[PDB]
Amino acid sequence: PKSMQCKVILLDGSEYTCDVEKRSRGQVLFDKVCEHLNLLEKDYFGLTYRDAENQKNWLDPAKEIKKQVRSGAWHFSFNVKFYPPDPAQLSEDITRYYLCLQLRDDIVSGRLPCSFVTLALLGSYTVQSELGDYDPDECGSDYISEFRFAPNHTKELEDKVIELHKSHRGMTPAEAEMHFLENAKKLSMYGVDLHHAKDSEGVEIMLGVCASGLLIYRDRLRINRFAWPKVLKISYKRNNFYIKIRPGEFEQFESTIGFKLPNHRAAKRLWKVCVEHHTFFRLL
Ligand SMILES: CC(CO)(CO)NC(=O)Nc1ccccc1
Numbered sequence: 001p002k003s004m005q006c007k008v009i010l011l012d013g014s015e016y017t018c019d020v021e022k023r024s025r026g027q028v029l030f031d032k033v034c035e036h037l038n039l040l041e042k043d044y045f046g047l048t049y050r051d052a053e054n055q056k057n058w059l060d061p062a063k064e065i066k067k068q069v070r071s072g073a074w075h076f077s078f079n080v081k082f083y084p085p086d087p088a089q090l091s092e093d094i095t096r097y098y099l100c101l102q103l104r105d106d107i108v109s110g111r112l113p114c115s116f117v118t119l120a121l122l123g124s125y126t127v128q129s130e131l132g133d134y135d136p137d138e139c140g141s142d143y144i145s146e147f148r149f150a151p152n153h154t155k156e157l158e159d160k161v162i163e164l165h166k167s168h169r170g171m172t173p174a175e176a177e178m179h180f181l182e183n184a185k186k187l188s189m190y191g192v193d194l195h196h197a198k199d200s201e202g203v204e205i206m207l208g209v210c211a212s213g214l215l216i217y218r219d220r221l222r223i224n225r226f227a228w229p230k231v232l233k234i235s236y237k238r239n240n241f242y243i244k245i246r247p248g249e250f251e252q253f254e255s256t257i258g259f260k261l262p263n264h265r266a267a268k269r270l271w272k273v274c275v276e277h278h279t280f281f282r283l284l
């Protein structure tokens, strides 16, 4: 029974290695990683791989690993797939812990833009969780944390993290992680998966997929939002992504908005993440 070596980048930046039978479905590997992580609330997470075009793809747990990674290495990342709109409602602290690690990467990466003050507040909760109560012994006027807090670090940001850290004395890791999440969840790009597209006129837009629905970012002024209760249906055909929108009350016919994606695989990928978000967040 022939087994393939799998390497998984975990959210703390470490590598987990295991073997699975070469015809294994993605669920097999996912269950191994979640068991390793002592994670029970698995529904919010998934594994990603990089395709031959270097795009992030979700490993479908129902399909053979080999028919997804195809010619590529059996190398994966463990990630949050469905960002909960209300992390306080997760049943376990360890779930909230992995969600914090994902969000810290979302922030450092620049995927999740954040004000100076929110970067410092989020950083101060991470420090409280990881080091516990503020200690001046590991902090002179020239302190710079090992912790990555932001896409670009400044001495002013380091200083503000420490000032807020001082205010958190007695806070437990679970408490600091909950505070991190109560702040992070309000950011306008929290749990937004962004896809480059062109509108029907050929203007470059971004399409966002999240818990609430679909967002079209035309520019900083003019963002169209389609709550899942407003989207009737979605479709991909060749390079084309189409969204069908319900009519307003006392109007006969749904409207269609068409988008042009880079290639057929990018159209399919957007369609699949939309269907998955719609299913998940219809039910949740
Ligand atoms: C105005 C508000 C606060 O955000 C009231 O709850 N709802 C939304 O903005 N919903 C939404 C729809 C589609 C995509 C993203 C968000």
Ligand SMILES: CC(CO)(CO)NC(=O)Nc1ccccc1
Residues within 6 Å of the ligand: 228, 231, 232, 233, 234, 235, 274, 275, 278
């Ligand atoms: C089976 C299929 C696949 O596309 C076609 O009807 N379902 C959807 O598209 N469901 C959907 C509904 C509202 C919002 C987003 C997706």
